[PDB]
Amino acid sequence: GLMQFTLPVRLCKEIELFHFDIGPFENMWPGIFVYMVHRSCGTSCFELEKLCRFIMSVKKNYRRVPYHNWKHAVTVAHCMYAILQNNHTLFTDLERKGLLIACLCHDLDHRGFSNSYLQKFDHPLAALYSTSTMEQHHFSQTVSILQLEGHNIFSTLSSSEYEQVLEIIRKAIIATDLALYFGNRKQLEEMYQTGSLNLNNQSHRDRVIGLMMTACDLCSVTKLWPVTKLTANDIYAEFWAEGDEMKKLGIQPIPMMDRDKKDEVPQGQLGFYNAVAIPCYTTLTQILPPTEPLLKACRDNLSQWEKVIRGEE
Ligand SMILES: Cc1ncc(C(F)(F)F)c2nc(CCc3nc(N4CCCC4)nn3C)nn12
Ligand SMILES: [Mg+2]
């Protein structure tokens, strides 16, 4: 009740910035998450005992893959924290509650393979969920963990509040399917530019929360260059294992997933920052101006990838 989570001074100041790295000490990540809920939501949003048990069951359901792991979950949640704290007054209490949980949960039980590989392998999850296969799985795992004894962090909510928050989390987790991002950002771009964008329209809110999810999900491109560059090595460690598995099924992988195209990595990054990252953070900055430091950091990392190609990095 009278209990506040605190952090050492360098973490207490730097956790408020978009470019914070949560560090290599795994055992601090739960306390960092609770810290962020307490400040973005309040010490009253969740029963501590339930939240702690929820966080630990979530952790235990992330797998030790190179990229889609528990460290990614807490990272994606820290970027959401930064966005929420810089746009305090645009979001409901349910949204604040819902989005940090959504982010912590958004890759639950990820196996290090894309929707496309599950569909080519004919994994049972691809018969249960024909599109956004892992993302429907992640929400399904979130509901499982919420239904364990002593894990319903939302038990204090009304039936209708409970249903709204699970609906926010579902839509937020689905939006992390990058196949959906392109159309979502296009609509948002057109709505912002024609001035039709209306934050009282629930279906507009949805699209805006969807774009925030894509921004948080991609936030490795918004970090200090060494973090960005070393995360890219984890990302490719997964993509190249997937490429190997595609070849095992007798299918030439796309170049992104082929370890034989290691040398094209710099140009593949440029394509990615130009086709995905920069547009994502541009539109987000138009809609929520205090998120500009994510766009400014993305453009700095693009220019670091340009330096690598020129031989200067
Ligand atoms: C930094 C980052 N964050 C998130 C994601 C993701 F979308 F997947 F979440 C992501 N994907 C990639 C991969 C980019 C990429 N490499 C390549 N090839 C072509 C041949 C050499 C490399 N083609 N392309 C488009 N980087 N990356
Ligand atoms: Mg995902």
Ligand SMILES: [Zn+2]
């Ligand atoms: Zn993710």
